[PDB]
Design a protein around this ligand. Structure first.
Ligand SMILES: Nc1ncnc2c1ncn2[C@@H]1O[C@H](COP(=O)(O)OP(=O)(O)O)[C@@H](O)[C@H]1O
Lengths: 49, 385, 796
């Protein structure tokens, strides 16, 4: 994951933070940045680098 | 070994004009003019690209010693006349003959091969010409002051620009005037001049179209041209690469061969019917391109003018070998006190209406030169501290 | 003037051409009437501005100013005008043709050595058109030829004019009646200078109006008398020159010390900008601070005593303002420079002695070669007079050099009277302390700062973010110069939930985020929300736009704030650096400092939610102390940690979440507590050892080192009655605050278990960098290659 452009990481920070806060509340439906339509979630997800 | 070839290339001229010593005969044997030509040649091919005047003084000492060495049969005569440090055989093309404006201004093309040593008529024709350039160009706005070193520098630009297949790198700090001098030096030589303009978007196509027009001026039309790149006309390296290959080969890959080389070449073979003169019978196809590259390189002179200071100049030279290799190199030292007092009196003669005082004017012009040399030193100290 | 004048007159003397003694360049160039007219137009009344105005007047070519402050821009804004920026698509096409064909004068104010080439050939055809254009950032790098075209003028303010400007502004704000008297008498005496001019006009009229038959005009007698009458009012004006030059002067002498101090302060805070970029600010912000300070505490009664209270209060106000932006390693330095710049005028401290204090054996035998270097360092007024048998007595000062804290209790009696006098005796003591013992430089630094400036400066500060919010109006943002392993984002959000009622919106810089940022900002403009930009250290092209956006022109709904965060990237244009609020949030230095901060992160509901005062209260205290110890261990260097690690609170509340689960689900089955718990606390050891804090650790040895710290601090049991190796608590909140209060400021490394001598090396390297910082602020192909040439014939 590291060998990647710096600004791309800058915006990825936002995306992953949004999903983290979404999962924290245990909210069924949430809003994703940059993408106008509303989208759902399932709990058993995870991220790894 | 290039400079030896350049020395000879300069020597080989005047198939019979050297013989015509009879008009001058200024204590001149036919050989004397020849050895003077040798001396001026060796100076201009070797005693130019050197930084300090002392280095010059030692090469002229070498030249005098070697002339005495070979010329072991009239050595006292050369010592009397040309080995003397006094000015000898300034060679020029436009001063020696005068058009005379008989029925039209350009009555006859001046004789071109040689001139003799003199400074007066040199300056008078220079001022003549300056007035002409003033009325040729609207808003010329060119108060050029002509002092001895400036005259020599214009002469050197002439020497390089004229030669078939020549070009010369000019170095010197800004204000030395090289960019100003070359305009006149090109107008006298009938050469067209164009500069590059860096648009709001800095890109590459401008270079290509301008060089295409330049070749078609020096190719199909066959006119005489000149090119005036400077530090303002470089925004990245790449321009230097394209020009580099232009000095070397002259064929741009598929700029002229985009289904155009044959139409342009076909617009030229009518000249070929008489020029190469294959018994006025026929020709070939590739050989036309050969003659075309011949023509364009024969009439595309390149005048480059760089800064001596900064960071980029030296490693730019190292990047591209042909640049400093093919072109002649000429230094412009800062003006010494003689030039400055000369300018002071040129501007005080017309301004000494109310400031009337004998024996104090000369000291005035002297002291003004002193002031200028000094603000140089103050500049140095401010940057230092 | 000096260098150029001596230069030209020596040229004239050597030339032997005659020249007049005395320059008086301004006097015989321009009539003073236009000078006064400009002084109404905002031209500063002092010499340097006078020659500057002359220089613009001559107008040999179009000018270009080096403009650190903005005198020229305001002057031209007022001189005869009473504008179009360089960066604008219409400017390059529209504004050019309007000015060039109808003469609008086309001012420009954003030169940064980068020229749109179309600017030039316009420079060199309406005959009613001029053009003045100026730079902003000082120390230009203009090309040689940009010097060929245009004249260059430097408006770098001198302190000398600066104290007069501040003098005028203090006379304004402290009581307007002083300005009433000032401007009244000043207008009167200006008009009386014009009355002397009218006397001159009367003399000229007497002399050449008739131009013949003056004598037959017997009214000439009356004319002669009239001359006398005008001189009489000049005599009144003459008296006024005294009444001025004392009264207003003493009203100014009450304040011109203040102005001096003010100017000193400003020229101090200039140079830190050269210490590092981003410590850059205007004079205008300083002016607001100055005028405010006058408003804040100035007038009570007893005006002379209030002058002394100026000198007390203004210094602290500006001082704290700059500290809010400063970094840790530069904290001590700015205060140090302030002290020196204060004393370079009153005490007349020699710059040579300053360089002695910054930079620097046959005689003595006991002391070390490391020490003998310092003997020769001090050796080369009475420094070169008392290294002899006086210093070489070796009677009682051996204990002295052995004693820790040499300065305080075992004072040197080498010069007891000189140390007693104290006007310079501090500085003498400090030259001594540095030259002898560079180890204890820094506390001595704190000491004489406390002396010459007051101990209030050498005291802790911590910025209440709720307090800081009160500063931020809607029309100024909040910058954040952060360091690794620290972010206030959570606290900013927390406040935005506390006082404000909505969550802030956030946009991270990057690529392809300009328009996103702009549209969210427009939403904030219309509404009044809060916006959190992030990672401005890359993607700087959007920054220049922000300054244009945050303007009075485009109106903004109230309650709209902006919050900016970035990092150390030079080539960051100072449009917003010149107009913003700078704050630093690297973690605190001292053990008590970090401990206190941690005791203001997760508090009052973590702490207050217990259902047990006994066990897990103690566990919180244990883990918090562990946190604050292992973080601070790194101060020493490779002895404490092989490499640096960036522990922060995330691991803390991770551990807290674990152990609260463990205790809640333990006691969920506990119907009765024997003594408050029945825990088997060995699993918690393993967890806090290898899982929570195990993330950062790249070395092997650090693993068992950290396990050992766990062993010695946890003890494997909650004793309830024992002395921590370092006290132990009671069970109330403000008692914890007091517990922090009684902690010492500077500790000793045996608190960590680590040996005293560790201290030594730290201080040395610390001292070794500190001076070097300030040492930067002062204003090859040779025999070395021959030395190497001789070397290479010596390797085998
Ligand atoms: N011999 C000269 N006498 C007076 N002014 C000169 C002279 N040479 C150059 N200048 C001034 O310097 C300016 C720039 O000249 P330029 O030819 O660019 O010199 P350089 O090529 O050394 O930069 C001109 O506009 C002119 O005003």
């Amino acid at each position: 994951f590291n060998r990647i452009d710096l600004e791309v990481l800058s915006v990825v920070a936002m995306q992953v933070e949004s999903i983290t806060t979404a999962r924290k509340q245990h909210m069924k439906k949430f809003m994703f940045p940059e993408e106008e339509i509303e989208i759902e979630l399932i709990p058993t997800v995870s991220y790894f680098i | 070994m290039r400079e030896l070839s350049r020395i000879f290339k300069g020597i080989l001229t005047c198939k019979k004009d050297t013989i015509n010593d009879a008009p001058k005969s200024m204590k001149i044997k036919p050989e004397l003019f020849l050895v003077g030509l040798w001396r001026h040649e060796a100076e201009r091919v070797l005693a130019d690209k050197l930084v300090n005047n002392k280095d010059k003084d030692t090469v002229m000492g070498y030249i005098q010693e070697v002339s005495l060495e070979s010329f072991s049969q009239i050595e006292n005569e050369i010592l009397e006349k040309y080995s003397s440090e006094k000015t000898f055989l300034f060679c020029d093309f436009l001063r020696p003959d005068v058009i005379n404006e008989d029925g039209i201004i350009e009555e006859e093309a001046p004789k071109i091969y040689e001139a003799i040593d003199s400074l007066t008529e040199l300056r008078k024709r220079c001022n003549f010409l300056l007035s002409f350039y003033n009325d040729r160009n609207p808003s010329k706005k060119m108060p050029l002051v002509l002092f001895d070193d400036a005259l020599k520098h214009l002469l050197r630009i002439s020497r390089i620009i004229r030669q078939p297949r020549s070009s010369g790198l000019l170095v010197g700090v800004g204000g030395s005037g090289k960019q100003s001098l070359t305009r006149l030096a090109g107008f006298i030589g009938k050469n067209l001049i164009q500069q590059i303009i860096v648009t709001k978007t800095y890109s590459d196509k401008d270079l290509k179209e301008d060089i295409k027009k330049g070749f078609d001026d020096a190719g199909h039309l066959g006119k005489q041209v000149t090119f005036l790149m400077t530090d303002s006309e470089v925004k990245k390296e790449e321009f230097l690469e394209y020009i580099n290959m232009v000095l070397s080969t002259g064929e741009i890959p598929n700029l002229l061969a985009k289904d155009e080389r044959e139409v342009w070449l076909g617009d030229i073979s009518q000249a070929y019917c008489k020029e190469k003169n294959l018994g006025n019978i026929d020709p070939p196809q590739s050989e036309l391109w050969t003659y075309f590259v011949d023509r364009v390189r024969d009439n595309f002179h390149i005048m480059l003018c760089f800064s001596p200071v900064g960071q980029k100049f030296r490693e730019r030279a190292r990047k591209f070998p042909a640049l400093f290799n093919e072109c002649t190199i000429d230094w412009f030292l800062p003006w010494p006190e003689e030039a400055l007092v000369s300018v002071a009196e040129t501007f005080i003669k017309n301004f000494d209406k109310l400031d009337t005082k004998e024996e104090t004017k000369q000291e005035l012009m002297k002291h003004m030169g002193n002031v200028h040399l000094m603000v140089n030193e103050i500049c140095d100290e401010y940057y230092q501290k | 003037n000096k260098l150029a004048q001596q230069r030209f007159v020596v040229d004239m003397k050597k030339r032997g051409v005659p020249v007049t003694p005395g320059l008086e360049l301004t006097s015989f160039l321009i009539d003073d009437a236009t000078i006064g007219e400009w002084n109404l137009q905002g031209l500063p009344k002092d010499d340097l501005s006078i020659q500057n105005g002359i220089m613009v007047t001559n107008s040999a070519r179009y000018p270009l100013f080096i403009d650190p402050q903005g005198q020229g821009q305001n002057w031209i804004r007022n001189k005869l005008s009473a504008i179009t920026t360089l960066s604008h698509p219409k400017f390059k096409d529209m504004f050019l043709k309007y000015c060039m064909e109808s003469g609008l004068t086309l001012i420009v104010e954003n030169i940064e050595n980068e020229v749109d080439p179309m600017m030039d050939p316009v420079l060199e055809l309406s005959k009613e058109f001029k053009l003045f254009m100026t730079c902003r950032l000082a120390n230009p790098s203009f090309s040689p030829e940009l010097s060929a075209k245009t004249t260059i003028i430097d408006f770098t303010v001198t302190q000398s004019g600066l104290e007069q400007q501040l003098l005028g502004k203090v006379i304004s704000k402290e009581q307007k009646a002083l300005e009433d008297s000032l401007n009244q008498l000043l207008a009167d005496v200006n008009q009386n200078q014009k009355d002397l001019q009218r006397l001159d006009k009367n003399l000229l009229e007497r002399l050449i109006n008739s131009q013949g038959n003056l004598l037959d005009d017997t009214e000439l007698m009356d004319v002669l008398n009239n001359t006398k009458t005008q001189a009489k009012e000049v005599a009144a004006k003459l008296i006024d020159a005294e009444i001025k030059t004392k009264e207003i002067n003493e009203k100014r002498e009450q304040y011109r010390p203040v102005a001096i101090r003010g100017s000193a302060i400003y020229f101090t805070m200039i140079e830190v900008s050269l210490v590092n970029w981003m410590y850059n600010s205007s004079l205008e912000q300083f002016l607001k601070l100055f005028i405010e300070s006058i408003d804040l505490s100035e007038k009570a009664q007893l005006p002379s005593n209030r002058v002394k209270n100026i000198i007390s209060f203004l210094t602290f106000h500006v001082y704290r303002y700059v500290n809010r932006g400063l970094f840790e390693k530069d904290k001590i330095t700015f205060i140090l420079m302030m002290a020196f710049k204060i004393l370079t005028t009153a005490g007349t401290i020699s710059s040579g002695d300053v360089s002695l204090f910054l930079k620097s054996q046959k005689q003595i035998s006991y002391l070390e070669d490391n020490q003998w270097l310092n003997i020769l360092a001090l050796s080369k007024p009475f420094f070169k007079e008392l290294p002899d048998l006086i210093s070489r007595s070796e009677n009682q000062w051996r204990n002295w050099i052995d004693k820790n804290d040499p300065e305080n209790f075992p004072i040197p009696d080498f010069a007891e009277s000189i140390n007693q006098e104290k006007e310079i005796g501090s500085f003498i003591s400090l030259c001594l302390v540095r030259s002898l013992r560079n180890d204890r430089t820094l506390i001595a630094t704190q000491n004489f700062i406390s002396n010459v400036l007051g101990k209030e400066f050498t005291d802790p500060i911590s910025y209440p973010i709720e307090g800081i919010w009160q500063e931020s109006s809607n029309m100024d943002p909040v910058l954040f110069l952060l360091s690794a392993g620290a972010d206030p984002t959570s606290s900013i959000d927390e406040l935005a939930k506390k006082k404000k009622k909505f969550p802030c919106e956030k946009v991270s810089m990057g690529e392809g985020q300009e328009r996103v940022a702009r549209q969210v900002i427009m939403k904030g403009f219309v509404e009044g929300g809060w916006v959190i930009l992030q990672n401005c250290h890359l993607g700087l092209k959007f920054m220049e736009e922000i300054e244009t956006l945050v303007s009075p022109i485009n109106q903004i709904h109230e309650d709209f704030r902006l919050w900016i965060t970035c990092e150390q990237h030079p080539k960051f244009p100072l449009g917003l650096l010149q107009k913003t609020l700078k704050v630093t949030n690297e973690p605190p230095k001292g053990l008590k400092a970090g401990l206190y901060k941690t005791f203001t992160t997760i508090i009052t509901q973590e702490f207050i939610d217990k259902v047990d005062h006994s066990n897990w209260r103690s566990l919180i205290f244990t883990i918090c102390f562990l946190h604050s110890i292992v973080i601070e261990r790194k101060k020493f260097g490779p002895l404490g940690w092989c490499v640096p690690y960036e522990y922060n609170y995330s691991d803390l509340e991770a551990s807290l979440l674990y152990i609260e689960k463990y205790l809640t689900n333990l006691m969920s089955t506990p119907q009765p507590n024997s003594h408050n718990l029945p825990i088997s606390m060995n699993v918690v050891r393993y967890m806090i050892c290898e899982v929570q804090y195990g993330g950062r650790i790249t070395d092997d040895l650090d693993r068992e080192l950290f396990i050992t710290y766990g062993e010695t601090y946890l003890k494997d049991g909650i004793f309830g009655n024992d002395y921590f190796f370092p006290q132990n608590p009671s069970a109330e909140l403000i008692k914890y605050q007091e517990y922090i209060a009684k902690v010492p400021t500077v500790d000793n490394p045996e608190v960590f278990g680590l040996h005293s001598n560790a201290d030594l090396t730290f201080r040395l390297k610390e001292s070794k960098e500190m001076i070097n910082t300030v040492m930067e602020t002062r204003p090859r192909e040779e025999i070395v290659q021959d030395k190497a040439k001789d070397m290479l014939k010596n390797l085998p």
